Design a protein around this ligand. Sequence first.
Ligand SMILES: C[C@@H]1O[C@@H]1P(=O)(O)O
Ligand SMILES: [K+]
Ligand SMILES: [K+]
Ligand SMILES: [Mn+2]
Ligand SMILES: [Mn+2]
Ligand code: NA
Ligand code: NA
Ligand code: NA
Ligand code: NA
Ligand code: NA
Ligand code: NA
Ligand code: NA
Ligand code: NA
Ligand code: NA
Ligand code: NA
Lengths: 139, 139
Amino acid sequence: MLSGLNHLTLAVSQLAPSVAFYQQLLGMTLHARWDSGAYLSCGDLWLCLSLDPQRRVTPPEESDYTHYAFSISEADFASFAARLEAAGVAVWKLNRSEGASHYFLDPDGHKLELHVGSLAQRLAACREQPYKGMVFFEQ
Amino acid sequence: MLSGLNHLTLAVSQLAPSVAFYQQLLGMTLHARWDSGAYLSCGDLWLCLSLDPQRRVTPPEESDYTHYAFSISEADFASFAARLEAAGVAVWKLNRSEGASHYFLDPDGHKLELHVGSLAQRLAACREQPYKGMVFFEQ
Ligand SMILES: C[C@@H]1O[C@@H]1P(=O)(O)O
Ligand SMILES: [K+]
Ligand SMILES: [K+]
Ligand SMILES: [Mn+2]
Ligand SMILES: [Mn+2]
Ligand code: NA
Ligand code: NA
Ligand code: NA
Ligand code: NA
Ligand code: NA
Ligand code: NA
Ligand code: NA
Ligand code: NA
Ligand code: NA
Ligand code: NA
């Protein structure tokens, strides 16, 4: 039986710039680095950066909606997003769903998000205003 | 400051087959589905499947190393992987690192993994046998 997310691994085209992005701009903890990768952590999240010379720098209009959202408190959200903006980090979408979200890109075009709010909060908002054709499942 | 992964969103080409994969073959909890998505949970992990016309069914040799790993116990690992293989779920990589891992594909070719072990256990094993060029960082 599966108990949660064990780790997220992102293919990166240049290791040093990607480590700098996740460690310095996003504040994650760098634990180890080798010739072809790095290990970082973000709370309980284990992030592996894997050097892959065939990772394409991908424009967001050419990639699908697959994306990775990190948790942040409502008190920290606005200034964190403002620093990413000041650092020239590109935004790939405007927030259109409940709970503050900032949708931004990593150096290789991986689609990322800062989000304030839980699954329980999202389901509660959906129960008041269901999405199109939505069906609810219980205990 | 980021506190962990908030949610993982996967673009899918056919919603019902993808829900069946994550709910029935991987055992995750289905909370809600709608015309263009579904919300599931796996322990603390909030998984969103997003119906996206841009998603193509992608052979593993046409995608990079980016992949998503779920936690499983030592005791459950072998039979869980065997059930996936018996369900026709393809394997995309042989395990070559510390701790049991099974590398498998979802219906659209998203690269997935079952893994037994934590970041702390990986770091300890890496100190004993360092990867090429591996360096570690204190605290
Ligand atoms: C929560 C799932 O990623 C979608 P959203 O970011 O559009 O809300
Ligand atoms: K949102
Ligand atoms: K492994
Ligand atoms: Mn999202
Ligand atoms: Mn992995
Ligand atoms: Na971790
Ligand atoms: Na993608
Ligand atoms: Na950018
Ligand atoms: Na960048
Ligand atoms: Na989390
Ligand atoms: Na589960
Ligand atoms: Na959408
Ligand atoms: Na690869
Ligand atoms: Na993939
Ligand atoms: Na993917």
